[PDB]
Amino acid sequence: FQFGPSIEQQASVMLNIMEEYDWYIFSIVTTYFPGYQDFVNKIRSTIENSF
Amino acid sequence: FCIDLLIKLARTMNFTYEVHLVADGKFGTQERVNNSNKKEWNGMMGELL
């Protein structure tokens, strides 16, 4: 076990700081680093589940 | 209305049927739930799939 953030919950904090300062305009830039599947999927999921 | 039409559909298309009410009581919508981090259908739509 590790004292480390997850890729998903790091993306969750990214949207939290966007919400407080009202940054709703998005742009995802990723590479072939083996975590790009999980990073954008978590971000895409939260977009569709809020007013 | 729909049971009378179903009896007609079964007779012409020659199949037998077992009718059961939907357990959820709902017609069916896509719900994330987020327990599995994936959307799933509820209601009659979920039962069919």
Side-chain angles (χ1 to χ4, degrees), chain A residues 45 48-49, chain B residues 32 34 39:
Chain A
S45 85
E48 75 202 9
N49 294 335
Chain B
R32 156 71 49 80
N34 214 12
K39 315 186 75 38

mmCIF file of all heavy atoms in Angstrom, chain A residues 45 48-49, chain B residues 32 34 39:
data_model
loop_
_atom_site.group_PDB
_atom_site.id
_atom_site.type_symbol
_atom_site.label_atom_id
_atom_site.label_comp_id
_atom_site.label_asym_id
_atom_site.label_seq_id
_atom_site.Cartn_x
_atom_site.Cartn_y
_atom_site.Cartn_z
ATOM 1 N N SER A 45 -16.720 11.356 -17.272
ATOM 2 C CA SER A 45 -17.850 10.843 -16.506
ATOM 3 C C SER A 45 -18.516 11.936 -15.680
ATOM 4 O O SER A 45 -19.747 11.990 -15.591
ATOM 5 C CB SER A 45 -17.386 9.700 -15.606
ATOM 6 O OG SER A 45 -16.862 10.195 -14.389
ATOM 7 N N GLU A 48 -21.037 14.681 -17.445
ATOM 8 C CA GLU A 48 -22.397 14.318 -17.820
ATOM 9 C C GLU A 48 -23.334 14.154 -16.632
ATOM 10 O O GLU A 48 -24.522 13.892 -16.841
ATOM 11 C CB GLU A 48 -22.389 13.020 -18.628
ATOM 12 C CG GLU A 48 -22.150 11.781 -17.783
ATOM 13 C CD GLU A 48 -21.624 10.611 -18.586
ATOM 14 O OE1 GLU A 48 -21.284 10.805 -19.772
ATOM 15 O OE2 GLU A 48 -21.559 9.495 -18.035
ATOM 16 N N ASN A 49 -22.848 14.302 -15.403
ATOM 17 C CA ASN A 49 -23.619 13.969 -14.212
ATOM 18 C C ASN A 49 -23.786 15.169 -13.288
ATOM 19 O O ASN A 49 -23.653 15.053 -12.068
ATOM 20 C CB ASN A 49 -22.969 12.810 -13.462
ATOM 21 C CG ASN A 49 -22.996 11.518 -14.251
ATOM 22 O OD1 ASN A 49 -23.847 11.325 -15.115
ATOM 23 N ND2 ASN A 49 -22.056 10.628 -13.959
ATOM 24 N N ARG B 32 -26.165 6.099 -13.847
ATOM 25 C CA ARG B 32 -24.756 5.804 -13.617
ATOM 26 C C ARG B 32 -24.558 4.983 -12.350
ATOM 27 O O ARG B 32 -23.756 4.040 -12.336
ATOM 28 C CB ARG B 32 -23.959 7.105 -13.549
ATOM 29 C CG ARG B 32 -22.659 7.013 -12.775
ATOM 30 C CD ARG B 32 -21.630 6.190 -13.528
ATOM 31 N NE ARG B 32 -21.512 6.609 -14.918
ATOM 32 C CZ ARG B 32 -20.814 7.659 -15.326
ATOM 33 N NH1 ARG B 32 -20.144 8.415 -14.475
ATOM 34 N NH2 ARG B 32 -20.786 7.953 -16.622
ATOM 35 N N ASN B 34 -22.722 4.877 -10.209
ATOM 36 C CA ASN B 34 -21.314 5.130 -9.916
ATOM 37 C C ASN B 34 -20.709 4.090 -8.988
ATOM 38 O O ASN B 34 -19.506 4.157 -8.711
ATOM 39 C CB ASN B 34 -21.073 6.527 -9.325
ATOM 40 C CG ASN B 34 -19.750 7.116 -9.759
ATOM 41 O OD1 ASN B 34 -19.099 6.602 -10.669
ATOM 42 N ND2 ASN B 34 -19.339 8.196 -9.105
ATOM 43 N N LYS B 39 -22.673 3.228 -16.526
ATOM 44 C CA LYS B 39 -24.117 3.397 -16.611
ATOM 45 C C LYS B 39 -24.807 2.057 -16.833
ATOM 46 O O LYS B 39 -24.304 1.193 -17.555
ATOM 47 C CB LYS B 39 -24.472 4.361 -17.741
ATOM 48 C CG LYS B 39 -23.621 5.611 -17.787
ATOM 49 C CD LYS B 39 -24.126 6.590 -18.832
ATOM 50 C CE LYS B 39 -25.392 7.288 -18.366
ATOM 51 N NZ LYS B 39 -25.358 7.598 -16.912
#
